[PDB]
Amino acid sequence: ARRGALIVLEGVDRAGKSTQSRKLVEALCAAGHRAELLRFPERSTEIGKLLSSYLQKKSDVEDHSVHLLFSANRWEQVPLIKEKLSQGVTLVVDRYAFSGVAFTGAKENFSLDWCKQPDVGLPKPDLVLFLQLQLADAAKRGAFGHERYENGAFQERALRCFHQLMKDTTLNWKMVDASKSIEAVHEDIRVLSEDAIATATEKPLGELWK
Amino acid sequence: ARRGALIVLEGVDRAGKSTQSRKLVEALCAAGHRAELLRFPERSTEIGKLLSSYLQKKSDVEDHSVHLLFSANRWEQVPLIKEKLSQGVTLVVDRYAFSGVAFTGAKENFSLDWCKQPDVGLPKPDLVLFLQLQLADAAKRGAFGHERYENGAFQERALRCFHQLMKDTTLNWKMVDASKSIEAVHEDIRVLSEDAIATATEKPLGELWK
Ligand SMILES: Nc1ncnc2c1ncn2[C@@H]1O[C@H](COP(=O)(O)OP(=O)(O)O)[C@@H](O)[C@H]1O
Ligand SMILES: Nc1ncnc2c1ncn2[C@@H]1O[C@H](COP(=O)(O)OP(=O)(O)O)[C@@H](O)[C@H]1O
Ligand SMILES: Cc1cn([C@H]2C[C@H](F)[C@@H](COP(=O)(O)O)O2)c(=O)[nH]c1=O
Ligand SMILES: Cc1cn([C@H]2C[C@H](F)[C@@H](COP(=O)(O)O)O2)c(=O)[nH]c1=O
Ligand SMILES: [Mg+2]
Ligand SMILES: [Mg+2]
Ligand SMILES: [Mg+2]
């Protein structure tokens, strides 16, 4: 009956969202929690394959259409998310609706309001971690990628959108200094996550942006 | 330079949306207009096939996800719609965003506001025809179908949603008595359409619900 927590990891490019989400699930399970990992986009579904082809530049998709497919890709996982949480399983998610708004919101003539609407009503995270890293430190972690959106100019506009989203006080945002070592960042994230898991059993799962 | 008009046909089940859209395009072209037919859902695209499988009950899709796919299926045709209109081609469309809101809006716990958002900003129709028919007269036109949403209880909830949408004065709604003969309904629609085509060359294409 004691529900699991919904924990989201957001963050700048190469700050370590995927490395930290994997390590968090491993550590929680080793400490006796029931925890599982999710990511968005979830490329395994029918909509997920359309999204993967788009990000790889194997296909072009009209900007509004692709924004709605990224949102639909979250909604198709909502029945699973609510089932797992109600069963006491904590979910750790590598990117969520915040990345959806920030990446479309970085394109010309896309307001933050329009971008948020499709995701209104999704399961509300109990904890949103944002992994911060200065661009000099990110550069040492590798060269850009060949997927769509992998260029500094675009990443910088998405970052401004993320800062606008962080003003929303309906959400439990926590900043994480992702400039430290893999292990030191993990310990900071893990302690914040243990606290969130404990309190989530106290209030019902909320709805995002409503 | 004289743009074409965007004309939408909406209406109750079996009122004749598809019969009248076909006959309208044929008559406009015979009278010297450049006119072409479109329909939604457009089942030929990747998203269109997902939608067709859902309507045929060959697959189940989560309600929010399917609502966003119906909207994305309109946005993927926006570059074509704007190109055609700018080239002076009038477009006659069998269903549009109004059916999108009314059909999802008929399901439990779906507000009209949430349903409208994804379609905010689409090309705004210059003329929205709504084909009205009493349920007794519809029954004589055949038996229900085996596709999703083909049942009187659901169609009745969608009808209430359409009436809420008709209160919006930003749109040029025209009621059509679809109880007459195929030819008499066509003449009423055709005369309204000739008037709309003439004035559309006067004002820029608008944006829906904004
Ligand atoms: N704290 C860290 N210090 C040094 N390298 C890191 C750190 N976190 C991640 N990395 C490395 O940087 C790269 C990007 O990490 P990744 O977790 O894939 O980031 P994201 O998912 O945020 O793009 C990987 O090679 C990873 O091993
Ligand atoms: N005015 C009308 N009078 C009689 N039958 C009609 C009329 N309009 C359409 N029909 C018939 O009713 C059926 C439904 O028409 P259709 O155009 O497919 O409706 P919709 O697309 O609105 O469901 C078809 O068999 C069609 O021939
Ligand atoms: C969830 C989500 C991710 N992205 C983008 C962000 C990024 F460029 C890309 C691949 O994500 P990973 O970096 O996590 O591989 O997908 C979007 O553009 N919208 C979304 O809704
Ligand atoms: C455009 C549109 C149509 N429909 C529904 C309405 C109907 F039951 C179905 C098939 O449409 P046709 O009746 O025009 O075949 O699809 C929706 O549910 N949402 C939409 O956005
Ligand atoms: Mg990653
Ligand atoms: Mg039809
Ligand atoms: Mg609003």
Swiss-Prot record, chains A, B:
Variant or mutagenesis effect after changing residue 126 to N: In CONPM; loss of catalytic activity in patient fibroblasts
PROSITE patterns attached to this UniProt entry: THYMIDYLATE_KINASE
Catalysis performed (reactions): dTMP + ATP = dTDP + ADP
GO process annotations (BP): cellular response to growth factor stimulus; dTDP biosynthetic process; dTTP biosynthetic process; dUDP biosynthetic process; thymidine biosynthetic process
Residues engaged in binding ATP: 14-19, 95, 180, 190
Protein name, as recorded: Thymidylate kinase
Pathway: Pyrimidine metabolism; dTTP biosynthesis
Keyword Nucleotide-binding annotated: yes
Disease per record: Neurodegeneration, childhood-onset, with progressive microcephaly: An autosomal recessive disorder characterized by global developmental delay apparent from infancy. Most severely affected individuals have severe and progressive microcephaly, early-onset seizures, lack of visual tracking, and almost no developmental milestones, resulting in early death. Less severely affected individuals have a small head circumference and severely impaired intellectual development with poor speech and motor delay.
Annotated region described as LID, given as residue ranges: 131-155
Alphabetical UniProt keywords: Acetylation, ATP-binding, Disease variant, Intellectual disability, Kinase, Neurodegeneration, Nucleotide biosynthesis, Nucleotide-binding, Transferase
UniProt cross-references to SUPFAM superfamilies, sorted A to Z: P-loop containing nucleoside triphosphate hydrolases (SSF52540)
EC number: 2.7.4.9
Xref: Gene3D superfamilies: P-loop containing nucleotide triphosphate hydrolases
Modified residues (N6-acetyllysine): 167
Higher taxonomy: Eukaryota, Metazoa, Chordata, Craniata, Vertebrata
Subunit structure: Homodimer.
Swiss-Prot/TrEMBL cofactor(s): Mg(2+)
Gene designation: DTYMK
Function: Catalyzes the phosphorylation of thymidine monophosphate (dTMP) to thymidine diphosphate (dTDP), the immediate precursor for the DNA building block dTTP, with ATP as the preferred phosphoryl donor in the presence of Mg(2+).
